[PDB]
């Protein structure tokens, strides 16, 4: 039985914190929002319900003080939108200690790398930092202190920095989180960012609908055959980038069907998912910064063309007046600036 | 009083043919469609109605034989979609004679140039070829032999090859078509292609709606503020191309308002215009081939960047699997290959 720090008490945060507490571990949870922490404190528990997980959980601690949640943890689970990773790394830098395990859920593209870079810049001790490319849970918290859990993934790719510590890492969480399965390195998990394909493009191709708040089923109506075919050509660029590092990451289709259109039209799970109701959506903010941007940067490195990814990237930036190539995850933010394709491979081992 | 050949008996073709015939000129009209020519023949007239033009017109001739319509004409008006210009030039090459005036209504970007190139390649006599950037009439033909004319533009830019013949040209049609006003040269008319801005982009940004046949008012609902702002940034590229040749062509706004959104939301004329109901639309086929393509090619020549035009161009090509950069109007098709910005200016004088 160990101490887990759960950072971020959003939908996922709620689920991990309940899951862990119901499994007999000590859970210390944090969220930047004091108010939210205050409502959960009043309630005195986190109620989990649904097919995937049901129970009344009791974290050992709820706080809005990051150091208090982290300082004494054995494992630190970070469950926030990838756009926040940097901020969290800088903030916890002073509390971490040699021997802790940090896991980004998930890392989007380059979460562990970016995380490692910031910690070293802030003179932190060397620690093992892992990342998963998927979300363990499908859930929704209607209010603080509550979470509905539809399901829990049965297998999850997991990789860390440094890669040799993958076994030890998994040896640590194995009893409680046997879903994690080690892949070669963090390039594998980071290049398996399906959201970078499925979110920005279809949203761009439904821009007016989204801006105008005109309701539509994101998957069912937002992705017609030609939109699915275009997404497949963007996916092919991702795959070509993975092959240039010698990795065999799965295509969007494999991630779910001979086509994306078939895959999407056929998952009943997508029944009822609405598209964005405005352009200030994560499908752009997060998936472009932590997905398209790094993908493009990477392809530039290994000299693999990404004309479609770039075209999408450039149109979205202008469409919303955000210089994503500057604000997103650049090779520099990942600590990969001036490395050759082989140098990059060597940096993750 | 003279002989006019009206080529193309679509909406515009119907209107010109009626207008001219009601004005006492001899009209010989053609259309590639025998059937259509046959229905109009049966009816024995063209009925024009509406505020802009009303009357029962009698062309002197209706035929599906191009040479018969052209051989004896003094002025030849071509009223077809710009994508057809090439074909028509090649087909009439053998019937034209020194002294005739050809006018493309309109020329889209580079209509007169492309037209001139094909005629010379086919060993035709030298003739004056003009183009207008606008459509004289706003009309609709519900059936062959009929046309509803809302209105007739009061002023139209007109330019020709060779530019010095602009006065003579206008001296020729002046009595019947006083709406035409000479501008400097064909670069002016060709760079004043507002459709290249207003059609491809908004359609792309409503791709799913269009493909799915989901009804919407093209202007009113397809162009939201951010879509209008993006169009303005594409327009700026067009304008930068015009400035590099020393021309002052009007912005989309001037062509109609401080913004495109304001302009469009405010014209009652756009009340009731639906967006495309599929992707096999002229807003792509015509406006990309005869608008975006040549604009991009031109900017490349005068060394003016057109990242947004290119981005739109590349996304549409892939979106519909059509290599527009190959099939559209290239510098080569315009007979401008290997000319310096100044050489291009010299070719139109």
Swiss-Prot record, chains A, B:
Annotated EC: 1.5.1.28
Task: Name a Pfam family for this protein.
Answer: Octopine_DH
Q: Which UniProt keywords apply?
A: NAD, Oxidoreductase
One GO molecular function term of this record is:
opine dehydrogenase activity
- Entry superkingdom: Bacteria
What this protein catalyses is: (2S)-2-[(R)-1-carboxyethylamino]pentanoate + NAD(+) + H2O = L-2-aminopentanoate + pyruvate + NADH + H(+)
Q: Which InterPro entries match?
A: 6-PGluconate_DH-like_C_sf (IPR008927), 6PGD_dom2 (IPR013328), KPR_N (IPR013332), NAD(P)-bd_dom_sf (IPR036291), Opine/Lysopine_DH (IPR051729), Opine_DH (IPR003421)
Q: Subunit info?
A: Homodimer.
Protein family: Belongs to the lysopine/nopaline/octopine/opine/vitopine dehydrogenases family.
What biological function has been recorded for the protein in this entry? In the forward direction also acts on secondary amine dicarboxylates such as N-(1-carboxyethyl)methionine and N-(1-carboxyethyl)phenylalanine. In the reverse direction, the enzyme also acts on neutral amino acids as an amino donor. They include L-amino acids such as 2-aminopentanoic acid, 2-aminobutyric acid, 2-aminohexanoic acid, 3-chloroalanine, O-acetylserine, methionine, isoleucine, valine, phenylalanine, leucine and alanine.
Its name, as the record gives it, is: Opine dehydrogenase
Q: In the record, what lineage is assigned to the organism producing the protein? A: Bacteria, Bacillati, Actinomycetota, Actinomycetes, Micrococcales
Give me the gene this protein comes from.
odh
């Amino acid at each position: 039985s160990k101490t887990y720090a759960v950072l971020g008490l959003g939908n996922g945060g709620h689920a991990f914190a309940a899951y862990l507490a119901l499994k007999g571990q000590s859970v210390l949870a944090w969220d930047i929002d004091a108010q939210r922490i205050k409502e959960i404190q009043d309630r005195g528990a986190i109620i989990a319900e649904g097919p995937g997980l049901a129970g009344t959980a009791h974290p050992d601690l709820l706080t809005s003080d990051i150091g208090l949640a982290v300082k004494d943890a054995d494992v630190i689970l970070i469950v926030v939108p990838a756009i926040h990773h940097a901020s969290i790394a800088a903030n916890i830098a002073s509390y971490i200690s040699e021997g802790q395990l940090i896991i980004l859920n998930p890392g989007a593209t380059g979460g562990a790398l970016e995380f490692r870079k910031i910690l070293r810049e802030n003179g932190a001790p060397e620690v093992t930092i892992g990342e998963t490319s998927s979300m363990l849970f499908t859930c929704r918290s209607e209010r603080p202190g509550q979470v509905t859990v539809n399901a829990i993934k049965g297998a999850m790719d997991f990789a860390c920095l440094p890669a040799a510590k993958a076994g030890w890492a998994l040896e640590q969480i194995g009893s409680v989180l046997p879903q994690y399965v080690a892949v070669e390195n963090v390039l594998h998990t980071s290049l398996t960012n399906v959201n970078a394909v499925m979110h920005p493009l279809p949203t761009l191709l439904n821009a007016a609908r989204c801006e105008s708040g005109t309701p539509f089923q994101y998957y069912l109506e937002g992705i017609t055959p030609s939109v699915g075919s275009l997404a497949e050509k963007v996916d092919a660029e991702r795959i070509a980038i993975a092959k240039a590092f010698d990795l065999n990451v799965p295509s969007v289709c494999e991630w779910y069907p001979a086509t994306i259109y078939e895959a999407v039209q056929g998952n009943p799970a997508y029944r009822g998912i609405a598209g964005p109701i405005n352009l200030n959506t994560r499908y752009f903010f997060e998936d472009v910064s932590t997905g398209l941007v790094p993908l493009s940067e990477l392809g530039r490195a290994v000299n693999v063309p990404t004309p479609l990814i770039d075209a999408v990237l450039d149109l979205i930036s202008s469409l919303i007046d955000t210089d994503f190539r500057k604000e997103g995850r650049t090779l520099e933010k990942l600590g990969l600036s001036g490395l050759t394709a082989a140098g990059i491979r060597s940096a993750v081992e």
